[PDB]
Design a protein that fits this description.
Assembly: dimeric
PDB class: hydrolase
Structural class of chain A: alpha/beta
Chains A, B: Putative carboxylesterase
Number of domains of chain A: 1
CATH topology of chain A: Rossmann fold
CATH superfamily of chain A: Alpha/Beta hydrolase fold, catalytic domain
Strand content of chain A: 15-25%
Distance between the termini of chain A: 27 Å
Radius of gyration of chain A: 16 Å
Helix content of chain A: 25-40%
CATH class of chain A: Alpha Beta
Oligomer: homodimer
Keywords: Structural genomics, Joint Center for Structural Genomics, jcsg, Protein Structure Initiative, PSI-2, hydrolase
Entry title: Crystal structure of a putative carboxylesterase (lp_1002) from lactobacillus plantarum wcfs1 at 2.09 A resolution
Strand order of the largest sheet of chain A: 1-2-4-3-5-6-7-8
């Protein structure tokens, strides 16, 4: 909460909450953290929000629906992200947000949430929230160490089989910046490579960085703990800037 | 040729030539440049050799067999690279090369040559050159803006169909660092993504960077002309160092 207005806002029709760090209009980042759908690692979320806040972004973090709030989780976290994007656009003027530069940044399981948001914002999220698609648009998406868990899934009842983000890449998918680790023996980067291939085939703009960064847990701990900058951040910021 | 011993050596049983820039023992880079198999862009080759020379490498560039030297080209350039690796190991002591840190770095069509070298060094190159596999080992390989052309191909007579480097990834493939451009509308990065997927499936160590760098031609021109450093170089050097 470093010299910035901290704001806290519970989202409507959900237990999800949003925390914001606020400094013309600025681009805005919404950090969708990890946590295996069991908890939200608040310190990770805040640190990653500050990584962007420090480089000219209004930065938010989303505490999304967890397994303890609802089971089956369903797609509640993806919907929660929509509620968050919509609130940012609605309040852009009073928060000095450029409503055309709202970017969800998903980490670990939050990368899965964000990947699916990029696929369904104009369709399933819009119709579930009954919000106009334009209000839910992610201007770009960022995915850091994405992790797929079968906890996410089952009006709109898709099981983990039809939640392969790489199978539902469409023309409404927006530009995507992805980075992950190549050498986690427990979680190969093959899923992420498949998503990039789907983006490339659908001709959705992207950038992909598969680094030798070790296990996903250590890699994301380092990203949080040791960005003050890390190449993933330099690269994400440059990509975001050049897409403006 | 900046304050370093420049050496020139024609390789045996080939029109291919090698140029070297020489400063304990040092790692060595062999630049396999582009040129569409019609010419070798010497200025590109030299500049890229210097990019590494300046960071503690003995650096060489390979002027490989061209379409004007031999048609069909066959796999002559891949064999030429083997001849070059073998010569470096043979003369490591007098050139202050660490014979366990010899790394071919392929650019544009040379990336295809190097990708195939990583696949066939212990098998088809060894048997065509009648050289022991150990002498031909690439300790790591680097691929920058790789481009596949059907000019490469047809003792060992494979047509362009059986020269998909991603189809012949085996356990003898060595660690691979790849970077390319995501947004060349004429040459999508899908081939490179497929190779990375094959490396990942075969559990060969790798790092992949698909940047929004524009058309392949401009991207490689920039790499040559504007590294003095560019992130692809920082990233390649760090990866090479951490694999030691």
């Amino acid at each position: 909460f470093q010299g910035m207005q901290v704001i806290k806002q519970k989202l409507t029709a959900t237990c999800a909450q949003l925390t914001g760090y606020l400094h013309t209009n600025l681009p805005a980042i919404i950090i969708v953290p990890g946590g295996s759908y069991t908890h939200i690692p608040v310190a990770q979320a805040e640190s990653l929000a500050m990584a962007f806040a420090g480089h000219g972004y209004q930065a938010f973090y989303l505490e999304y629906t967890l397994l303890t709030d609802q089971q089956p989780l369903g797609l509640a976290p993806v919907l929660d992200l929509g509620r968050a994007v919509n609130l940012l656009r609605q309040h852009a003027a009073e928060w000095h947000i450029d409503p055309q530069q709202i970017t969800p940044a998903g980490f670990s399981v939050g990368g899965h949430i964000v990947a699916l948001y990029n696929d369904y914002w104009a369709t399933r999220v819009a119709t579930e929230l009954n919000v106009t698609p334009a209000m839910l648009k992610p201007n770009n998406v960022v995915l850091g160490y994405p992790v797929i868990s079968p906890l996410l899934g089952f009006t709109w009842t898709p099981t983990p089989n039809e939640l392969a983000a790489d199978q539902h890449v469409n023309s409404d998918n927006q530009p995507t910046f992805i980075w992950t680790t190549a050498d986690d023996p427990i979680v190969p980067a093959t899923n992420t490579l498949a998503y990039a291939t789907a983006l490339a085939t659908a001709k959705i703009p992207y950038e992909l960085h598969v680094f030798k960064h070790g296990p996903h847990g250590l890699a994301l701990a380092n990203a949080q703990t040791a960005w003050k900058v890390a190449h993933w951040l330099t690269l994400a910021l440059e990509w975001l800037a050049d897409n403006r």
